[PDB]
Amino acid sequence: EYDYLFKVVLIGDSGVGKSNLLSRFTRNEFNLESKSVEFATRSIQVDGKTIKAQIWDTATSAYYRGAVGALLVYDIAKHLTYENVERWLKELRDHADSNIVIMLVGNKSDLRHLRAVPTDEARAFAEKNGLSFIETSALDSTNVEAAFQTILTEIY
Amino acid sequence: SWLLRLFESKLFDISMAISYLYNSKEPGVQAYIGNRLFCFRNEDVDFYLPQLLNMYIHMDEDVGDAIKPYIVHRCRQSINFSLQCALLLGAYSSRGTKLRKLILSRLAPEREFIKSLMAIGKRLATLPTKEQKTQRLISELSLLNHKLPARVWLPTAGFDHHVVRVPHTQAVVLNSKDKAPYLIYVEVLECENFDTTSVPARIPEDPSAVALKEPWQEKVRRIREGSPYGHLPNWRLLSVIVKCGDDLRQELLAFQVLKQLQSIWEQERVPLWIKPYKILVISADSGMIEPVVNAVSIHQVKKQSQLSLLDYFLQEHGSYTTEAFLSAQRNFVQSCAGYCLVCYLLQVKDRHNGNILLDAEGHIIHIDFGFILSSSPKLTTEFVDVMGGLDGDMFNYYKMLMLQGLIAARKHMDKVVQIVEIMQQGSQLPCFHGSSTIRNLKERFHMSMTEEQLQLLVEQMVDGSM
Ligand SMILES: Nc1nc2c(ncn2[C@@H]2O[C@H](COP(=O)(O)OP(=O)(O)O)[C@@H](O)[C@H]2O)c(=O)[nH]1
Ligand SMILES: CNC(=O)CNc1cnc2ccc(-c3ccc(OC)c(OC)c3)cc2n1
Ligand SMILES: [Mg+2]
């Protein structure tokens, strides 16, 4: 048996790699070639508890129904993805659960030479809204599991 | 994820990085490759600069933006690299126009030096003779020394330096054409890094102002003794041919193919000799050239001495028994076979003893790579004699070098065809007239043929070359 079943959601502009984050964290796989609603689950142990994380992925209100955690994934190689965070916030304010833990995610951190979003300025935005922050990379699995490990641990 | 295993692999170089960036329509792949560029050596990427900048201008916008970050980074580091980009962006444009205007927005001293040279050549259109032009040219170049040294450098030089002095008395117009080209000698001072050192100090009858046709070593010592900067160990002399009315873009493409062919034969351990001369594109109708020292056209050799090729060899090198002639002959054979493969693969036409040079060692060097491939408006007896007849043991060695040279040419045909295939992208060059110019290029390699059938190809190729 598993103790609880959380429902976290992956949103953001298409192309940030939220579909790859879903594969890396769960099935542990990443492909450069892309394709295209879908969700995948993997249970982890948190505080002596078994939690079946139900990660959702899109390509509205039904998307946010039962939503426990929120993952805003923006690209650090495309500043426009960081600009639309305010628009996605409005997307959350209107349909998402009033008490969901939003953890900002800066994917594609392996593109160190193509960085368009400052790591310190983006992390500061996480403090302005009191949201958890972390930059990941589904290509080399940097802070991939740590992202969901924290978002699932912070959900209590 | 096999593809990622390939990029992560050591087998992933700058050449293949351009391959995937040239074919892949995957934004994730393009952006990833645009990041790996920073990991490569600066030197390895520079060779494909004409390719990258060309892909940037004449391809999907999703491709150009991927290369832009790497390009901007290198421009912020090297003033020379900044100059190279600004020249190639405007030369192949007919998109990057908005980028060229910001790279130039420091390079004032350099740009002023290029315009002056090109301006000097243009005004020489009035003087109808080769002698008149050279008279006005020398007086014209003497004005440049009044504003030197300065933050100016010859990009054709294989090192950083500051142009200090210009021996105008040694300059000369090459021919009696309308927009005739002119060769100039430039005295420069080397350095650690151009973006580091400031402009050097400046220092000002009938001594060295003499113009003779002599070896490089002797022509430099004379210019040195008559030069104020000739006492510094940092001093060094360069030479470039300025063409203010010729499109050296196809010349640049031919250059890359020569270097690539040169590497292949060097890596496959095939003793073929070819000498690619550096090219510099200033625009779609101008540019400079660095001429190889101690080399003159065969036509100018048959004319100044009034002899045969074999006679000049025996006179300038020695008898058939002399070891000097043997080495000089070996240099001739390897150079012929080396450039024969170059003429066949590229389909170089308009081949005559005016476009074929000859150095002190005994090598031959082809020039003027116009009328190659699609564009268009031979083993002479004179050459066969120098190899000891058709049945000479050196002529058979010549046919053998072409075989194992063509064989090694197939083992790396991929890297070579890539150079030309990418450049055809959007270029209105005459060498890309036919719709299927790349196909004939690949078929001239004959990957389908066998080595037993290659010898027949080599033999039947030499026969028709007469
Ligand atoms: N360089 C790099 N590329 C990534 C990374 N994560 C994802 N990508 C690329 O981003 C592209 C699009 O991701 P995708 O799965 O479609 O995310 P989605 O658009 O949100 O559904 C894929 O082709 C991946 O190769 C990363 O960490 N580094
Ligand atoms: C001034 N004459 C000499 O220096 C004799 N020795 C040499 C030695 N290397 C050379 C390299 C390149 C060229 C060359 C190439 C392309 C040209 O336009 C297509 C060209 O026409 C200006 C000249 C001439 C060379 N000539
Ligand atoms: Mg997707």
Residue numbers in the entry:
A (entry chain B): 7 to 42, 46 to 68, 77 to 173
B (entry chain E): 128 to 221, 232 to 242, 306 to 404, 511 to 683, 694 to 782
Sentences from the paper on this structure:
Using HDX‐MS to identify disordered regions and map conformational changes in the kinase PI4KIIIβ bound to the small GTPase Rab11 allowed us to successfully crystallize this complex in the presence of both GTPγS and GDP loaded forms of Rab11 and to collect data to resolutions of 2.65 and 3.2 Å, respectively. This compound has been shown to be specific over PI3K kinases (10 fold more potent against PI4KIIIβ relative to p110α, and >100 fold more potent against PI4KIIIβ compared with all other class I and class III PI3K isoforms). PI4KIIIβ has a larger binding pocket to accommodate the glycyl methyl amide group compared to the class I and class III PI3Ks. The wall of this pocket is composed of L383 in PI4KIIIβ, which corresponds to a tryptophan in class I PI3Ks, and a phenylalanine in class III PI3Ks [Fig. 7(D,E)].
In this article, we describe an application of hydrogen deuterium exchange mass spectrometry (HDX‐MS) to identify dynamic regions within type III phosphatidylinositol 4 kinase beta (PI4KIIIβ) in complex with the GTPase Rab11.
